[PDB]
Amino acid sequence: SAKDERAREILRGFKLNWMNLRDAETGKILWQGTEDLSVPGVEHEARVPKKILKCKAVSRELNFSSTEQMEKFRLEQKVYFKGQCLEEWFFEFGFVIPNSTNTWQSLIEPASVLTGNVIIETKFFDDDLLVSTSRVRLFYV
Amino acid sequence: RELRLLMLGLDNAGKTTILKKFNGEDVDTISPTLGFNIKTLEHRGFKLNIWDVGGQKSLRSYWRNYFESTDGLIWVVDSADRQRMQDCQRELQSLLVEERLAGATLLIFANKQDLPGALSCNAIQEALELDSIRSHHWRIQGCSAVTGEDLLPGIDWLLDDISSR
Ligand SMILES: Nc1nc2c(ncn2[C@@H]2O[C@H](COP(=O)(O)OP(=O)(O)OP(=O)(O)O)[C@@H](O)[C@H]2O)c(=O)[nH]1
Ligand SMILES: [Mg+2]
Known about the structure:
The complex is a heterodimer of chains A (141) and B (165).
Chain A: H1 2-13, E1 14-23, E2 28-32, E3 44-48, E4 58-66, E5 70-81, E6 84-96, E7 100-108, E8 118-126, E9 129-140
Parallel strand pairs in A: 3-9
Antiparallel strand pairs in A: 1-2, 1-4, 4-7, 5-6, 5-8, 8-9
Chain B: E1 3-9, H1 15-21, E2 36-43, E3 46-53, H2 57-60, E4 72-78, H3 85-95, E5 105-111, H4 121-127, E6 138-142, H5 152-164
Parallel strand pairs in B: 1-3, 1-4, 4-5, 5-6
Antiparallel strand pairs in B: 2-3
Bound molecules: guanosine-5'-triphosphate and magnesium ion.
Keywords (chain B): Cell cycle, Cytoplasm, Cytoskeleton, GTP-binding, Isopeptide bond, Lipoprotein, Mitochondrion, Myristate, Nucleotide-binding, Nucleus, Phosphoprotein, Ubl conjugation
Family (chain B): Belongs to the small GTPase superfamily. Arf family.
Pfam family, one (chain B): Arf
């Protein structure tokens, strides 16, 4: 089917390039992610400085590329501590330009426990087709 | 209600530097936007979504796919770019008959005021025929994304105007 093929070039052409974490009060980066966040066979990780647990101002930025055009782009983000929910974010971008690189930032307003147990999962959809799924494990310091 | 702000202008105008400086982030390593840069935050109790869209010839034609449900449009000008000042005028007037932007509030940032050969606001006011604009509420404001001069005075007004209607 032509829809399948289309729904296939859309997947192939999408790439999450990087994620980062800032102290929203100062505007300073606390941690930016290299790092084939798209690659498989790898549990993506963030080694963030513990200060992050002290600010009230945290902003998380994403940067993504799309070779293909899409009409109903949206994302779903959830931060989990084990089974418990810390944050759940949603955003409808709608239209995404062909061969384009886009950014999305939101402002989010004890240790031995948190480290290695915090996961951020970003799910990306075109209308209702899943295009990409990321997972990043948090290690405080 | 969350407010949707839409930031446009010609490439190299200062859009992205303005959006970053406004959030207290560095502006020393900014590069051409090859898509859109969206920023979700809180200012003076307002829950905002600020869309900064690339202004190169190639990107411009996709501008209208973001018109829907826009509360305020920020038109950004390179005050020292007398060369494209008329192409700037055209783009803007063209934006003023768009039906999905009707009743949006217009804010004009006369950017790059920190530059030697920068036209005043009057000159830019005149250059873009703003006095002829009755379709929308507007206000021009000169500023400098680099020094951070007079950015809040513009956003604060815009925020208050949209809220009053
Ligand atoms: N002197 C001065 N230079 C500025 C000012 N604002 C932006 N610039 C310079 O203008 C250039 C383009 O700035 P950007 O922020 O990338 O412009 P933009 O409107 O986002 O451009 P596109 O991404 O192409 O739409 C850069 O070289 C910045 O250094 C300003 O107030 N004064
Ligand atoms: Mg830009």
